[PDB]
Ligand binder design. Structure first.
Ligand code: J80
Ligand code: J80
Ligand code: MYR
Ligand code: MYR
Ligand code: MYR
Lengths: 4, 266, 279, 62, 235, 279, 235, 59, 62, 62, 54, 4, 4
């Protein structure tokens, strides 16, 4: 994932 | 160093040697030199025949004359070589045969002559026909042997329906095949422009959708020679100079040996 | 990054190096850039050839066939209760011309089917929704003689059952060629006449043609038993080549196609009149 | 089996690298979509098939 | 049953899409590739190959072998243009059917530098100096060498090297021009003049052909794929 | 957080600092807050400008065109068996006015298509469900002369096949401008009249217009062969700009639009009557 | 086949939605951005720019250049208001077509402080003191300076600094007012009076114009996007 | 409700497909395999067995 | 490739930070939805284009 | 529970090993698709059922 | 991999080993390859029996 | 996962 | 995953  | 040049070549294959003092370098079609079938691209399982020097040497075809009205000449490979010495025998004794070629086109004149030959090596050169009837050119007509065929300035439809000629009608500006000649330069080629060079030298790899095929049923390469600029000399309105085509098979191999194929060319 | 080369800053020249002169006789195209012949500035180039890649050029579903099939009372005279089409890109011209920039190709094929229908006559009652069967019959397999005979049982042949009104049907086909690549052009024959043949028809063949059935046929029918009123339907087939590779470039077709080979017949005059010194 | 790649972003929203995700659902690769990540090559086999390839500032014929 | 909600676009068919679909012939044993010579990775490669220009589309010359031949002569009127042409690679009749013009006719937009190469097909005893030029758009299209000199140009000296190449540098206001004709995205004017004249000795032909070629430079690209007008089909 | 600045507590003043006085001649707006001119309390501010961001202002699908297409017996006189529309935001006024608060823009475009149909006449039997083809024809491409001619083959042009009754069709378009930004306004011409021109029509052009075809057309047709009874259909096109950027603000349109440029014709009186000293 | 269940909302189309969809022109080579001057990130930026108020909408003055001009005079009746106006930024005819009024007319709700700036366009020899005021809603709209003095106000002294700014502080009961007219969300009254009078010397014009400007303070915001009544279209 | 978009091919039936589907007889107690002699894994095994040719197809 | 962000929660249920998940399904960024996470900026290029920007408590003209 | 395997790639796009993902949704294995990953075997039980299996270069009968 | 066996390169023979002769009476199929009876080249085989599995 |  |  790329959770901001 | 020493004195070498782009214009002076010696080509040696088997017992044959060609010299030229006015070349315009030389072309290797698609950047690929001829080579034998590799084990990981191999399909027929029988041990191949590789005749080497006996077939991979220079055969010179019958000379054609270039004059002011000459619209152009064409040849197909292997067909132009079907009767050439042991190459021809190997071609007709085997079901399968692959081979690459060195093509050397020869045409000298004088510093006061003028004209330019476009020399084109075309993969799968399918030509257009005679008729209302599509895909109807007969095998014997499709294959002129060493003689080759010619081009025409225009489309004369073979009218005689009842007993049809079943010949090609190759129109020059359409490259004999429904396209414009000016784009034929995407094919491997050289130009014999008489103020620059005596000759053209094109090295052809075997090109096909298969590693090996029937040479009797299928031509791999077409050789088209069309005058891009017409022959001219001094003021003499009917000049004529010879064009000579010498071709050599390269890396020739044959599979599927049995009794000899004798095609009917009548 | 996939951008094209930057333009280099290039200044005045007085030298023995002459890029501007060449000899096209060699077979070569002169590799020149603007900076070889005029003074140039430095340009950081961002343009790219992303849309002209082989995949991007063919990445579009093209119409290759319109198959018409009727659903009506099986009377007793030549009807359209079922139809057959030989799979090809040659009944249409647009994709044919695109594929023919190249001598050989290799790819997977995506087929999409748009089905439309309508009432043929002013009125006899109506019709309940139709299901269509699109069956592939590879060469060798029994072809149907009747719209509901045993071949439609399709035990081994692949079939699509399409429901009218549903999203257009779609399947993919592997690379299925007998060779290592598809030949868009074949300078040869399927048979050779031999000196020892009885009639000289034994060895006769069509120039450029390879196998008799090429890749087989699509047999199409309406699975529904006929309504009292006739419904006419058309199946439009859109073909897209995917995972594409191509070999040996060719000049594009310049004059109208005349059948499955390279034959030309007329409109052999592709170019307009324009004066030599007219812009 | 998810495959993640960067998008080549053209018009950027007023909000850096953005990604997209791909998963193959079928065993036969013929069923797969087109990656469209295509590498290019030199034109030389077409623009320059010469046995002795020469440099543009030198005389083509020597 | 995963709760789902069908968005707009659902059940449509887009010709331009890119999706997976069921394989109709499962587990099929595919024929492997072999290394065939001549592979192409991008259409732009074909546009970088020099192809011969139909420069002469006059009434009796067009759709004939002579459409490719421009006559140069030692008695030509030196004040007049040898040839004049518009820089419209996909639209101008002389350029539109070249391999370049053909690839560009499958696209809506083009950008980049072009190069024109001319071949002297005269005798070796023939000499001459020719000025070939390119005027970016906006002014009067050149009618005199005097005006043509002022723009981008090459003075070609005939000699052992038989051919000359003029590069038309990318000089545009827009980032991409259109492949169709349009004054807003026009490319300018190409023209040719004698710088001196063709000079021959006696017993030599006083007249001869010039052939011309066009190809794209490595900065050239195209975009927005479209159908060509160069092929069609009757009912 | 994206909330607006808090109000500071501000007390009485007797000073040489005068925020309340200024000179608008400079071109500047006086940067004042309530605390510069009146006594204020401390307010912790929670309000935000989230909905007035450029994206949020345009983040809505707007109606830009109503294309009408008929499906009926191809008779022999001007009909609507297919239709063409030049892509634009200028046939409608609402989105046009919004985009025109700005001189230049850059964005991706989302198109959604609502298709409705009905029976034109009292009665001749009925119609089976229709599939619609929406084809994009970029400038240069062959335009259709007939509802089922070869151009609809769509081998390279993008086409949508919409089934009536399905969820409205939707696609996205990249930023496709020839420039670095779209010009909502162009103070210029596509051609210049030169002193050496033959007729003075050679150099004539429309003021403000740039390319002749702008961005091409959408060709629409019903793929279905005609029923006996006529069905009339309308395709409504909704346009939404996404991933938006805008430059150089402009005064909004105050009087009714009169064609594709800035021309006004009438209702040049936008403002009401109100007395000077009336609340 | 993943088991799914279609929820309500399925296959609808909402104008306000935010979803992905197929790209009709795949792999298109997009033109890069350049740094253009004047970029806008929020509509509220435009409402913070001072724009000139059509303060004078009397019968012959409206839809004319004079709608922007308020006449100040040394012989004006000092007891009367110079101007009176309602604090209805999107609805009041004098405010509704300013850049502020225009942005607010695309929204349903507004909140925040506003600032009015007046410019004296008289001669340099002209002097004067003016009282400009703001009465929050609920009482009688001011008819006398005496009543106006009692609310928020600025006494402007004319001099080298030519312009004066009165801030109308956010004083509201609701957290957001409506952009349309409504007594429940009314904003109050703006009025202007002479504090002393315009005084000129001889050989000087006794009459002159006052121009007025409006803009939003940094605490101002808007919400609930809507269509404006300020543009429409015939059949 | 996960936002989904129905692609072409949706609701079709392909004879050649390979998908899961509900089991009509759940939790059924299946009879186990036994080691039967003569198992075949590929049709090509049968083609490798010599079979006698009808070489003489005269009238 | 899943992207996770916090929602700006307006009306809070009687039940702290809540999140939402995004995944791009397509290679072309034009196909993407709008992030709506937009940064703002100063109005000064419009409200104050002055070569010598002056402070509000000082005389505008000096 | 996702299962990931390599595809046997036939026609390769101009863009190496590609994979596909499988998940079983149902408790009953009868509901499952076909893996189509099938191992082969020797034909000998059919082509050579001999008690004394002999080698091809030796005489079949001795 | 699931490809079929490669063809081995096989040359001339003059021996007491006779693969070409057999006795079908035994019930057995003669396990011969092209290289047992004719001269063969080396072929790297890529074909497979994937589609003819049960 | 159970990646084979 | 196989993130390229
Ligand atoms: C004749 C000239 O054209 C060609 O050479 C040429 C080359 C390749 C081509 O690809 C098609 C080959 C595959 C043939 C068919 C294979 C299976 N097809 C199926 C199968 C099942 C179903 C239900 N629907 N379609 C449809 C296509 C088509 C034409
Ligand atoms: C003329 C004034 O307006 C403009 O300047 C202006 C600027 C930008 C605009 O964006 C549209 C540009 C893209 C044009 C088209 C590109 C492709 N389109 C497609 C393509 C395929 C399909 C099936 N459906 N729609 C539809 C839109 C539209 C108008
Ligand atoms: C690699 O793919 C491991 C991660 C899997 C994530 C969940 C995938 C959900 C979709 C299942 C596809 C089933 C296709 C037959
Ligand atoms: C990053 O995305 C890795 C995690 C992937 C989780 C499963 C995604 C299931 C949806 C697949 C989208 C396929 C789009 C073509
Ligand atoms: C193993 O499967 C763990 C990984 C799960 C990834 C998400 C799967 C989403 C599909 C759920 C299937 C439910 C079937 C009843």
């Amino acid at each position: 994932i790329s959770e901001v | 160093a020493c004195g070498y040049s782009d214009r002076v070549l010696q080509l040696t294959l088997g017992n044959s040697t060609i010299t030229t003092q006015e070349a315009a370098n030389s072309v290797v079609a698609y950047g690929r030199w001829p080579e034998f079938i590799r084990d990981d691209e191999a399909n027929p399982v029988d041990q191949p025949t590789e005749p080497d020097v006996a077939t991979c040497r220079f055969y010179t075809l019958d000379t054609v004359m270039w004059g002011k009205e000459s619209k152009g000449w064409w040849w197909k490979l292997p067909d132009a070589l079907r009767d050439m010495g042991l190459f021809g025998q190997n071609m007709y004794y085997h079901y399968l045969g692959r081979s690459g070629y060195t093509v050397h086109v020869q045409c000298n004149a004088s510093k006061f002559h003028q004209g330019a030959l476009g020399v084109f090596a075309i993969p799968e050169y399918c030509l257009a026909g005679d008729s209302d009837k599509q895909r109807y050119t007969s095998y014997a007509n499709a294959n002129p042997g060493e003689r080759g065929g010619k081009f025409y300035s225009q489309f004369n439809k073979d009218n005689a329906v009842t007993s049809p000629k079943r010949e090609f009608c190759p129109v020059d500006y359409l490259l004999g095949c429904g396209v414009l000649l000016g784009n034929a330069f995407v094919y491997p080629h050289q130009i014999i422009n008489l103020r620059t060079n005596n000759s053209a030298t094109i090295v052809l790899p075997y090109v096909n959708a298969l590693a090996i095929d029937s040479m009797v049923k299928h031509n791999n390469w077409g050789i088209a020679i069309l005058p891009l600029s017409p022959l001219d000399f001094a003021q003499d309105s009917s000049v004529e100079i010879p064009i000579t085509v010498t071709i050599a098979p390269m890396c020739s191999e044959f599979n599927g040996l049995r009794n000899v194929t004798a095609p009917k060319f009548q | 990054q996939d951008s094209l080369p930057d333009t280099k800053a290039s200044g005045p020249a007085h030298s023995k190096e002459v890029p501007a002169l060449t000899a096209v006789e060699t077979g070569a195209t002169n590799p020149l850039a603007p900076s070889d012949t005029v003074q140039t500035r430095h340009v950081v180039q961002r343009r790219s050839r992303s849309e002209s890649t082989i995949e991007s050029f063919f990445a579009r579903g093209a119409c290759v066939a319109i198959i018409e099939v009727d659903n009506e009372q099986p009377t007793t005279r030549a009807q359209k209760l079922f139809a057959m089409w030989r799979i090809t890109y040659k009944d249409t011209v647009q994709l044919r011309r695109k594929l023919e920039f190249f001598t050989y190709s290799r790819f997977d094929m995506e087929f999409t089917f748009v089905v439309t229908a309508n009432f043929t006559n002013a009125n006899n009652g109506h019709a309940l929704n139709q299901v269509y069967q699109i069956m592939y019959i590879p060469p060798g397999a029994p072809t149907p003689k009747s719209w509901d005979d045993y071949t439609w049982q399709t035990s081994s042949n692949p079939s699509i059952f399409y429901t009218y009104g549903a999203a257009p049907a779609r399947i993919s086909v592997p690379y299925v060629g007998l060779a290592n690549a598809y030949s868009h052009f074949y300078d040869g024959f399927a048979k050779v006449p031999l000196k020892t043949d009885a009639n000289d028809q034994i060895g006769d063949s069509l120039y450029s043609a390879m196998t008799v059935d090429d890749f087989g046929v699509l047999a199409v029918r309406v699975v529904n038993d006929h309504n009292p009123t006739k419904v006419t339907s058309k199946v439009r087939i859109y073909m897209k080549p995917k995972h594409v590779r191509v070999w040996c470039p060719r000049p594009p077709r310049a004059v109208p196609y005349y059948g499955p080979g390279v034959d030309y017949r007329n409109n052999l005059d592709p170019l307009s009149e324009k004066g030599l010194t007219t812009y | 089996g998810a495959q993640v790649s960067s998008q080549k972003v053209g018009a950027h929203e007023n909000s850096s690298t953005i990604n997209y995700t791909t998963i193959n659902y079928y065993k036969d690769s013929a069923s797969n979509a087109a990656s469209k990540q295509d590498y290019s090559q030199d034109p030389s086999k077409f623009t320059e098939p010469l046995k002795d390839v020469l440099i543009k500032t030198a005389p083509a014929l020597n | 049953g995963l709760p789902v909600l069908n968005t707009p676009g659902s059940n449509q068919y887009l010709t331009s899409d890119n999706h997976q679909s069921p394989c109709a012939i499962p587990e099929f044993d595919v024929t492997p590739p072999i290394d065939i010579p001549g592979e192409v990775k991008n259409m732009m490669e074909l546009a970088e190959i020099d192809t011969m220009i139909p420069l002469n589309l006059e009434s009796t010359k067009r759709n004939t072998m002579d459409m490719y031949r421009v006559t140069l002569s030692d008695s030509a009127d030196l004040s007049q243009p040898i040839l004049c042409l518009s820089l419209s690679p996909a639209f101008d009749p002389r350029l539109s059917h070249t391999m370049l013009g053909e690839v560009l006719n499958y696209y809506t937009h083009w950008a980049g530098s072009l190069k024109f190469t001319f071949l002297f097909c005269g005798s070796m005893m023939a000499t001459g100096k020719i000025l070939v030029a390119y005027a970016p758009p906006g002014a009067q299209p050149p009618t005199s060498r005097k005006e043509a000199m002022l723009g981008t140009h090459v003075i070609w000296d005939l000699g052992l090297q038989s051919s000359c190449t003029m590069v038309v540098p990318w000089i545009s206001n827009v980032t991409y021009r259109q492949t169709t004709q349009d004054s807003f995205t026009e490319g300018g004017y190409i023209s040719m003049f004698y710088q001196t004249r063709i000079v021959v000795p006696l017993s030599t032909p006083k007249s001869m052909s010039m052939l011309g070629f066009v190809s794209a430079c490595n900065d050239f690209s195209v975009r927005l794929l479209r159908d060509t007008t160069h092929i069609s089909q009757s009912a």
